[PDB]
Amino acid sequence: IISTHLAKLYDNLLEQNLIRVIEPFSRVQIEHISSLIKLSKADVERKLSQMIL
Amino acid sequence: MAKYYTRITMKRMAQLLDLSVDESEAFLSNLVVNKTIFAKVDRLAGIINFQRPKDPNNLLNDWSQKLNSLMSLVNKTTHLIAKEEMIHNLQ
């Protein structure tokens, strides 16, 4: 049963981490935030678009 | 420096901390997210500031406070002036 909730927990935690790392400042490049979150650029861009929508 | 400065470039304060810019911002990030010092750094032009945004209620409120202080001071002057004249031109 743990594998049923592991993916959703990971997604929620990703959202939390992204909001935490964006929070401390303002306008910034995407390369730095991708390096901080150690992910690619396209997926981070889509995640940001979904969050802002 | 946040107590005295208003807006400052990245490299100047990095030099004043004797350590690299990335270390500076990484060290102040956990400070600002802990809500102990307020700053909004910009990582495109290397300009950082403090200076919380201005609310309409505040501006004219401080204006009224300055008015209050002015009235109190101008009221206090006259008594001192009167006691100055009293010791010289009473007789």
**A18, containing H or E segment:** helix A2-22
* CB contact at 8 A, A40 and B55: no
Listed in sequence order, the residues at least 6 apart from B37 whose beta carbon sits closer than 8 Å to its beta carbon are B2, B28, B31
Tokens of B74: 């101008």
Annotated resolution, angstroms: 3.6
- The verdict on a CB contact (< 8 Å) between B43 and A24 is no
Which experimental approach was used here?
Answer: cryo-EM
Closest CA relative to residue A15, chosen from A45, A47, A52? A47
* CB contact at 8 A, B49 and B13: no
Instruction: Please name every residue paired with A25 in a beta bridge, in sequence order, or none if there are none.
Output: B41
Round to whole Å and give the CA distance between B68 and B60: 12
Instruction: Please name every residue paired with B7 in a beta bridge, in sequence order, or none if there are none.
Output: B49
Residues of chain B positioned with their CB less than 8 A from the CB of A29: 43-44
What are A46-53's contacts with CB under 8 Å, separation 24+? A47/A14, A47/A15, A47/A18, A48/A18, A51/A15, A51/A18, A51/A19
- The verdict on a CB contact (< 8 Å) between B40 and A20 is no
Tokens of A44: 């981070």
Residues of chain B positioned with their CB less than 8 A from the CB of A24: 28-29, 32-33, 41
